[PDB]
Amino acid sequence: GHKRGEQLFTGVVPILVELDGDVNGHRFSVRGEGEGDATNGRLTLRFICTTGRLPVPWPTLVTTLVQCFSRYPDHMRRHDFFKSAMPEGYVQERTISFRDDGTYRTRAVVRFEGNTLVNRIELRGTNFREDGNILGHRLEYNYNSHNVYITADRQRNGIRANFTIRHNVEDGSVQLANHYQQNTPIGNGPVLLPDDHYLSTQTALSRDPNERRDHMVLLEFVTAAGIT
Ligand SMILES: [Cu+2]
C-alpha cells in the first residue's frame, strides 16, 4: 500500500482536525483546518476552541492535534508506516502522563475523507491538580523541538512511539509530559513496519490578531532520521 500511500502526499493536502475532550469533567471541542506538504515535512494549521476557552493550555494538545506529513528521506522510504496505511488510515492512541499531575488518554482516527486528511480525536484527562501548571494555565505559549522515537509493533502490525515533551513553565521550570503511543492500521492491505528511527519535530505556535475565539496557529516541520 506504500506506493499508493506515497502518491496521496506528493502535493499539498487539506487537513481537518476534530477533537472532543473531557478534562477533570470539563468538556471542550477543538476544530482545526489547514494543509500538509509531506514532500517538505510541513504542516500549517489553525485551531479554534469551539466551546469557549480551552480548559488546558494549548501547548498540551499539540501532540494530540498527523505524522503521515513527516518528510521521510528517499533512503528511509521503506520505514514510513504512516503513509503506507493510507487512504484507509490508522488508529493513533496515547497515554500522556504529566509529571506530578494528571493524564490524557487519546484515541484518534487518521484517514482520508475524499481528498482531505482527517484527524478525529477523543481525549479524556483525569486526576489533574486544580492549581497545577495545566489547570492553572502556567505553561508558556511556545514549544520545544523533540525527537519521536519510533519502533515496530509486529504483533499489532503497527508502531509504538515513546518521547517526553518539555513544556516551558512561566516561572522558568519545565513541565514534563511522558508520551506512550501506539498506531494500528484500519485497512487489511500491507503496511511498512519500520526499523527503529526518530521523527525530528519542530513546532512554531502563533496567534491570529483578527480572531476573537480561543485559538492556536501552528506551523510544524517534521523529518525522519536515525537510519543511514
Ligand atoms: Cu505498500
Distance 200 CA to ligand 1 centre (A): 24
| Ligand 1 center to 85 CA (angstroms) | 8
Q: How far apart are CA 170 and CA 203, in angstroms?
A: 19
Q: What domains appear along the chain, each with residue ranges and CATH number?
A: 2-225 (2.40.155.10)
DSSP bridge pairs for 119: 17, 110
From the CA of 13, how far away is ligand 1's center (Å)?
Answer: 20
Residue 59 CA, ligand 1 centroid: distance in Å: 34
| 1 CA distance to ligand 1 middle (Å) | 3
DSSP code of residue 129: -
Q: 3-state class of 101 per DSSP?
A: coil
Cβ–Cβ contacts within 10 Å for residue 133, how many? 24
80 Cα to the center of ligand 1, angstroms: 10
**What amino acid occupies position 178?**
N
* Alpha carbon of 154 to ligand 1 centroid (Å): 16
Residue 185 identity (one-letter amino acid): P
Q: How far apart are CA 79 and CA 148, in angstroms?
A: 14
Q: How many helices (H) and strands (E) does the chain have?
A: 2, 11
Grid coordinates given for 67: 505524522
Q: How far is the CA of 30 from the centre of ligand 1 (A)?
A: 33
Integer Cα distance of 60 and 143 in angstroms: 10
Backbone angles phi, psi at 156, to 5 degrees: -90, -10
**CA separation for the pair 134, 59 (Å, rounded):** 10
Cβ proximity of 190 and 102 under 8 Å: no
* Ligand 1 center to 159 CA (angstroms): 16
CA–centroid distance, 5 to ligand 1, in Å, is 7
Dmax (CA) for the chain in angstroms is 50
Q: 221: exposed, middle or buried (C-beta count within 10 Å: 0-12, 13-18, 19+)?
A: middle
